[PDB]
Each structure stands twice: as structure tokens, then as C-alpha cells.
Symmetry: D2
Subunit: 314 residues, 4 copies
């Protein structure tokens, strides 16, 4: 007597991106055509105020739901500012191949040509697509299906902000879904990370590189209890002499230091001079995404060679 449709659960982390989560759901009635949609409010914060406590709660809830036969896929609604941080964390900690799609809107729900309704519809379409199984955590905005591993927010305000210059999208939407790429990095069900038994994460802070910078921010991070530091270096993870003094001091005090880049794209490569002093390379992870992997790495090991190996596979 009923139409068979996928069971998609929306987990909201902030306000409504289209139009409570119950209403959010009624603002995009088109979703009923393609899913049996249900919803829950996890937390309710602006994305700059998403923190490690919330991430642990969110990953645990997703893992619980996806283990059930009554949930086919999940859509997480989230503020765009830090969406990429949450999406990549879930990419490393969700231990299921069922789809998890993270979505937001660049224009408020009340704005002229608000982008939330289409984004949400498309997120639910992807989350219920059989072919979305096994693709890793996905970010869906503006008719594009991006991997959490490769995507970033590239522009402050534009609808088309989430992109990957060098890796493009997993797929795109033009009425139908077109899947184009599968990523090569390890993810989701295949990672070595679990947050099932964790109530906190190792502290990791980020320091920026620039002309005439110093060592004082490294020293402050160490004093504040950082277990890891990601440095957003100029170019290919480069450090001034002052920054390198700070990084070396941190390493000597037992902090793991990973060199990322402030440029936005490309790989940070191992460099003999840096590698021999355990100033690690972030691969193609930007500073905030490198932080997520470093926190998780530090739950498993303090060995710099093992952490570097994670940065090449995840």
C-alpha cells in the first residue's frame, strides 16, 4: 500500500537552512517524492562554535543510526564556515559505507533566491542513491557532490564556494546524479580510528605563517596544553627561522608538529631538512583538515613516522 522509499534521517546542528528541524522538513515538501524523511536536532549552534565535544556526540550518534536497518542514509545540516572540518572528521570516524551527506546554505532561508531548499533536496537525493554507498563522506551544495577529503570553502559569501581545484567533485547533479570520481584515500569503514570510547580529543592548535612572524605563538600553544600543532606555512609548508625555532622547541617538549600550507591547494611534500627533525608534511590537507587527522592520529600513537604515514593514506 505504500511506496518504497529510502529512509533518510536529517541531523541538524544549527538553525534551518530552508523555510525547528520538523519545519525545516516541511519547507521542502519535494523531499517526500524521493525519501521517507525524519529529523532530529543534535545541537543548535553557529558552526564556529562546533567543538570536539559536539563532534564526538555527532559521530557516535551517526554510527548508532547507521548500524540500524531502519536508516539508509543521513543528511547533516550545518553552518558553512566550519562544515569542511566536521565533514572530514566524520569521513575518518563513521564506520559504515552508508551515505552521510553534509549540507548547508550560503544565503539565509529568508533571502531572495535562498539556496538551502535545493541544497537540502539534493542532499537527500544523494543520501538515498544506491551508488552513493562507499564514496566516503560527501558535501552537497550548488548541484555539486564533493568528497570531504578534497573539498574546502573557497569563498566568503558565494553560492559556489565549496570546490576542489585539483581534485574536482565526486559527482554533479543536473536533474539526475552523475557520479564521476571515487577518491583514492582510505575513509569511513576502513579507517584505523574509532571514537566509540572517547570523551575528549587531544588538543591541536593552528599557527599561521607570515613575514616577520615569531616563535611566541608556538610557545603559547605549548603552554596552553597543545598535544599537536599544525603550522599553516607559506608555500610548500615553509617556516621562517623564527617559526622553525618555535616548532623545534615544541617537538622537543613532546608536541607533534605538522606543516600544512596557507596557499589553499597542492601537496605539502616531505623535505629532508624538516623530516629529519620530525616537522611532518600535511600532504593535500589544509590546516583545519590536517588538525582533524592529527587529533585522531594522536589517539593511536605519538610516533612521528606512524603519524606521517597516516597523512599519506587518509
Amino acid at each position: 500500500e505504500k511506496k518504497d522509499l529510502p529512509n533518510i534521517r536529517i541531523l541538524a546542528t544549527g538553525g534551518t537552512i530552508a523555510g525547528g528541524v520538523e519545519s525545516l522538513i516541511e519547507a521542502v515538501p519535494e523531499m517526500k517524492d524521493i525519501a521517507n524523511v525524519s529529523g532530529e536536532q543534535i545541537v543548535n549552534v553557529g558552526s564556529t562554535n562546533i567543538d570536539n565535544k559536539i563532534l564526538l556526540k555527532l559521530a557516535k550518534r551517526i554510527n548508532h543510526l547507521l548500524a540500524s536497518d531502519d536508516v539508509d542514509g543521513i543528511v547533516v545540516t550545518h553552518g558553512t564556515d566550519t562544515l569542511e572540518e566536521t565533514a572530514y572528521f566524520l569521513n575518518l570516524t563513521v564506520k559504515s559505507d552508508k551515505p552521510v551527506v553534509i549540507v548547508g546554505s550560503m544565503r539565509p532561508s529568508t533571502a531572495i533566491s535562498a539556496d538551502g531548499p535545493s541544497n537540502l533536496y539534493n542532499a537527500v537525493k544523494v543520501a538515498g542513491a544506491p551508488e552513493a554507498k562507499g564514496k566516503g563522506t560527501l558535501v552537497v551544495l550548488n548541484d555539486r557532490i564533493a568528497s570531504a577529503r578534497y573539498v574546502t570553502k573557497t569563498n566568503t559569501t558565494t553560492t559556489d564556494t565549496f570546490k576542489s581545484e585539483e581534485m574536482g567533485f565526486v559527482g554533479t547533479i543536473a536533474d539526475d546524479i552523475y557520479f564521476n570520481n571515487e577518491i583514492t584515500r582510505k575513509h569511513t569503514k576502513d579507517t584505523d580510528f574509532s571514537v566509540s570510547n572517547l570523551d575528549e580529543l587531544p588538543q591541536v592548535d593552528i599557527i599561521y605563517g607570515y613575514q616577520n612572524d615569531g616563535s611566541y605563538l608556538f610557545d603559547a600553544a605549548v603552554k596552553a596544553g597543545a598535544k599537536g600543532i599544525v603550522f599553516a606555512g607559506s608555500g610548500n609548508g615553509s617556516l621562517s627561522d623564527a617559526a622553525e625555532k618555535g616548532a623545534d622547541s615544541a617537538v622537543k617538549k613532546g608536541v607533534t608538529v605538522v606543516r600544512s600550507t596557507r596557499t589553499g591547494n597542492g601537496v605539502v611534500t616531505p623535505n629532508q631538512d624538516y623530516a629529519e627533525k620530525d616537522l611532518l608534511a600535511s600532504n593535500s590537507l589544509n590546516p583545519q583538515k590536517a588538525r582533524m587527522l592529527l587529533m585522531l592520529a594522536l589517539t593511536k600513537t605519538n610516533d612521528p613516522q606512524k603519524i606521517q604515514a597516516y597523512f599519506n593514506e587518509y
Copy 2:
């Protein structure tokens, strides 16, 4: 006769001593009378305010003479955009200043430095380069210092502007396409002629679960200005906002930039009322250059904000 172009070197060679650079690209002799000097010799992460003052003063002196038609500065790529934008605000001439580097070492297969240097000299000597602002020339592209950034760690095509494109491109001949709308060079209100140091400005990065303690440390270290590389449109966590508000109360100017890479950071009523300023379309490290220079003129947040909308 040909334009007289002076090369000021700040690092190692990008092609083939400053005499070595010139000899490595003999083709330059057909488009300019090239001479050169070594200003400093450092990796670009070690370019600092002292060096920038020296470089700006030397450039301003040289461009005032009739024997110099234009200048090329050879520089490491990592912080090239910081130096280029600083010079865009402090060189008080319409004569061309072109910043150039290479992404591959001069000894590598298919080294890019020889072409880059040749093109930089071609642009520096082009009459239509007059009045364009400071330019950055790599990989057949002519970018404004105001809009360009290094977007990729290692690729030859790294210097770009997604939203503003290039001032021009080269395909044998130079094709000039755009003139920027921001105030620059000859028309700025900044002078560093008599300065021996610049107001200290530090940069703090925004991220989930960040804090106030890095703001506190920058203030303790003597920052006069702080640029915050905020997520999205210059957004702050509650903790970051506590740190920023603390800094403003201690007389530090705080400018919100973005970590995203592109777009404008807009004035936001909640932030603006608390003097947490907006960086416009300046990224953190370029915002830092304008904030340092603004602080040579004023501590008034409304005046500093107006500079961020015009420069």
C-alpha cells in the same frame, strides 16, 4: 633605444650573483638594457619589515631617476605576494615594478625562471605597464599585487586570482586586459621614507575548538594590530571573539580576514560596533601589510576601515 630595466635581487638565482641571472637569459638584451643589484639574499620566509623598508626606499630612489625606466624584483615565491602588495602601497611612482620568481629551481628540468624573468623584463619595459600598480609576473601571466595570491604549494601556475583574473597575459606579445580600481602606488597616502620600523602586526587563525590564548600572546608580544583569518566571512567563535575584544580594549586594532582564499569579508553590524573590522578582499597576509601601513597614520578604527575599502 631600449628601456633601462634594473633587477633588484632578494634571493638566489631564478635563471642559470645578479650577473649570473642576466647571462642566463641573453634574449633579454633584445628588449631591454638590463643592469642589476643584490639587495639582500634570503629565502622569502625570512623577508621581514626591515628588508621591506630598505627595498621600498631603494626602489623609490631609483624610479626618481631618468636612467631607470622600470624595475624587476626577483624574490622567493612563498611570501612574494606580501612584498608585492607592500610595494603596491609604498612605491610612489607610476613606473613599472614587476615581482618575479620561479617554482622550479634554476637547475631543474624545464626550469620556469628563465621565461618568467624574460617576461618580467618585457613587462617592466612596456609603455602600457605605466600606472598599472605593482605587478606579479609568472607563467605568462601579469597579475596585480592587489588581487594575486600563491594558490598552490608547488605548481608553476600557482599565482592566480579566481575572482579578479589577471591584469594581462603574454602570448608572444603582451595583452593587457584589466586595470584595477583600487588606489595604489603614485596615489597612496603612505610613505615609509623616514621609517626604521613598522607597527607590529600578527596573524591568528580560526578553527573549531580554537581559543583566546593566542590573541593574548600576540598582545603580550607587542602587537599593535592583529589580523584574524576567520572561517567563512570573517567569522569568530565565541572564544576567538573574547580574545579579539580583549585586544581591542588594550588598544590593538583587530581586522577580520578570511582563511577561505577568496571573496570579500563584509562589514557586519555586530562586529563593526565592536571595532572588529572587515578586510574586504584582502587575505590575511596581505591585510597585515595594509594594517601595518594604516597604523603609521592613525589608530582610528573608522579611518582604518576606510583604508581597507580603498586600497
Copy 3:
């Protein structure tokens, strides 16, 4: 004291409608007054009025319509009651109309071309914001003298540099090499002024013309031939634009067809199928009057070639136009 902005509607997706709100590629036809009433916020930034010029999908915009549109725009901008114009148009051939107007509008007052990638009925339809922003730009004092502009997705592109780069996405209109004249983030941020001659400063007028010289476009590919050149000449082409591989390159067969067209008095311009970059002069091709399209893609090169042929058949004068416009 608000600017007086006239909307001239021509058709396109922005005036299209489907009964399914989730259809972005299938749709049926909305009137200019409906477009306006759908965006009441416009009343706070302009005094808006509208007229329907034509009502067609943009692949059916033709030279007759362009002439009508350019003449109407020129007459309206001569009045003190009109501060700026917005043209609503289908996206498919928007760049052709925009660049034509960039060469034939004899005023420094703003002309902004706008469309949408989703129909008016779609969820998160993009037309309302695009239209608001087009009106905002057309009424901005700083938009004066910028050349014809194309406004979609919070971006303000020059007609000379923009193209439709994607079949279906909202962010399709871009210039990889030249970027945008400006962008919108609440306020307008003007960033660039183009260097090419435009609008009031061109040598072209269409005030006395009822038709344009026929120009056709031929595409380059492996195993192509001469017979499509021959067919374009037979069909009455006065000019041909060749969308060559790479930097306006021709196969031997294509070069045979081009050379035969030139011998019959047709002007041939080499453009590129790549999408970006400059088609440079080439000594061997220039000696045979196979001209270079500069940074004009095939369809935009066609617009300039048609107007050049209203002034001259001299290949050196035509080439000079391609370098300045």
C-alpha cells in the same frame, strides 16, 4: 531620487515555468510584469518599469531581433527618464547578445544583461536574486562607463570577457583569465575596468541597418574537411569564423576550405574551440588573410566580424578591430 531602470524582456529560462519545482532542465512563458512583481525588494533601490521586446528561447534570438533591441536601447538611453537598462534573456546565447550590445550601444549609461539557470518555478530559483542584482548594478553610479555587463550569481562580468562555461550550473558565467568587473556581497565591489574599446567609443552603428552581413561558424576537429566551408560560402556567408583546435590551428583540409573562401571574397577569422586564451597572429596564416580572433571565442568573434563587415572588407582593418574591441 531612485534611479529609473527599464527592464527589456526577451524570454529565456528566467521567464520559464514548469509544474515540477524540482525540474531545473525541463520547463515551458512568464511576463515581464510578473518577473518584476516577484522581486518587490527592487522598489527600495530603483523605480522599475518593464516592456516585452520579444519572447523566445535564446537560440532563437537572431540578427533581426538584435537590431531591434540595440535600436530600442539607444533610443531609451538618450532620454533623461532612463538611468539604466536591464535586459532579461535566455542564457544559451546571452554572451552573443551582450557582446553585440557592447559594440553597438552608443552611451555610457549601464546596460546589464541577466538570466537564470533554473526556471522561475524551481526550488531555489536563481532568477529573483539575479534580477535584483542586475537592477542594483544598472542603477549604480559607478557602473557608468564600464561597458555592457552580465550579472548572474552575485558576479558582474564584462560582456567582452565572459562566456557561459557550463551547460546547467548556476555559476556558469565566468572568465578564467580576466575574472569579473566586480562582485556583490550585500554591496557592489567594483574591481576591474576592461582595456578594450566599447559602447560609445566604437566605430559601429546599427541605426540605419535592417540586416547584418552573414557570418557562419565552422568547427575544427580530427578528420574534418573543406565541404562545410564550401557549404557556408554557397549559403551566402560574407564571413566565416573557424573554431580551430589550439591556437587557431587548421588541418590541411580546413585550410583548403578557408583559402577557397578567401579567394571568393569571404573574410575568414581563426578563433579557438579551447574556451580561453589568445588566438595570436601567425605569419603563414596572416600572409593568406586567415585572421586571428584575439581573446574572442567563436560566437563572440562572429558578432565583431558581422559589424566589421558593415564598415570594410579590408583584412588589415578587420584584424585591427579584433585587436582593439
Copy 4:
């Protein structure tokens, strides 16, 4: 021991005898080569494509060939690369390479391009990736790449699909494409001497039906239309396309935009004016020629356009 990499040259040298020009290659491969043809890339034709695919298929069947590099002019490089992606029945790497600057120019890009092409062709992880295009430290799929700029060194790109990988000293593989290719395709051309004729017609304002009519008269078996936007036709172009279909020609609507998918449109699909998916006109031509070696059924041809 090092992989055995064979270089098939189609024209002039892109570097500098290549081993002399780029001696670093000796440390990463045992290189050999041959001059299979000697033409400018605008004059690569169907006869040459068939010769190249037959020769590559033969070579890769040998146990002592680990991978192939083809040096090729950049203008039509994407056409050859995609054809080989559909016809090389092996998982071993085939890498197509060119240079945007002449070998004699300042900062010639060919030496690095060639070195990287050989590095990729010998990399174990390049197996099963489909035909690759390697220029400017980037590793692009033949299925997604195009030449996007007339003259720049960074011209080969895919805005929407990115690269299969990139090179920064080491190779970083990032994506595997989802379309069917190489070892898994249903196309076999080793015994064919010609391919069904396919021509391309451009869409623009004030276009007509005359070019369609001429292509049909010239013997086209298929026509790719480089339509404005999402494979759109003017009324005049549509009349020409419908005339062609009635005369037994298969018509595929591609796009002149450069990116995105051309979607099936009900009114066009009802009339067998097919959709090219995310294939540009010149790449859609290669798939249509091969489709026409198997069938004239428009539904089957459309299905090929959705999978390849």
C-alpha cells in the same frame, strides 16, 4: 629492475635522442621508442588512430612492455587520448604527453612533461586508471580532460572532475574515474580499416539548416552538434537535425560551453536527438564513431554515452 616503457612519437620531438635530451629518465625506466607516424596533430585522422590503437594493443599484450608514452601535438591530443581510452584493451598504462612551448624555446615544458609521463607510465598504481594525459605536473583522465587555453602551459584541465593525480616529486593519485574504459570496453577495432564518418556542426545565433544538409550529403553517418548551453538547438538547426535523423544519420547534441553535462531533454529524446553527457563535441565524435561500429539503435547509442 626498472619498467620497460615504449615511447611512440607521432611527430617532432617535444624535448631537446629523447633519452639524450632527458637522461634522468634512465633512472626510472628502460626507455625505447619508435616513430609510428610523423604529422602535425591537426592532421591526425581516423586511419592514424586505427594504426595507433592496433600497435598499442599489440605492444601491451607482450610481457616485456610495462607501459607506453605517446608524444603528440597538443591541439588534438584530447581526441587521440579519448579514442585510445575506448579502444586499448589492457589495464597497462598509456600516457599521452605534449608540450605547449617548442623544445627550443626558453623554459621549454616538454622535458619535464616527458619525464613525468614516463614516471607515470611505469608507476604500478597507474594500472587500471584508463588512458592518462600528463602535462604540467598533472595527471588527467582522457575521459575528463580538455585543452582549455590556446597557449598556456597549464591548459589541460577539468574544472568539474579535476585530475586523476598530481606530481610533486612523488606521484599523488587522488581519483579513479567511474566511467567504463580500456580493458572493459566493448569496442574492438584492431581489424577495421576505417571508421563511420562523423562530422561536427556548431550552434550560434542566426545559424541555419544548411550545414546539416551538407554533412548528410557528404556522407556523415553521425553528426555531433556543439549546441549553445545544454545542447540547445535553434528552430533552424533543429529542422536540419531532424532532416538528418530521417535520412538515417545519428545526431548527438553536445555543447560549445566547455563543461557540464548535456542532459536528455524529453522533446529532443522523443526525436532521437541524443545527449552527449559530459563529452565535449570532439570527444563525443570519437564515442559516436565507435558506437556506429556496433549499432544504429539510438537507445543503445544513448546508453553508450551514459557509460563511457
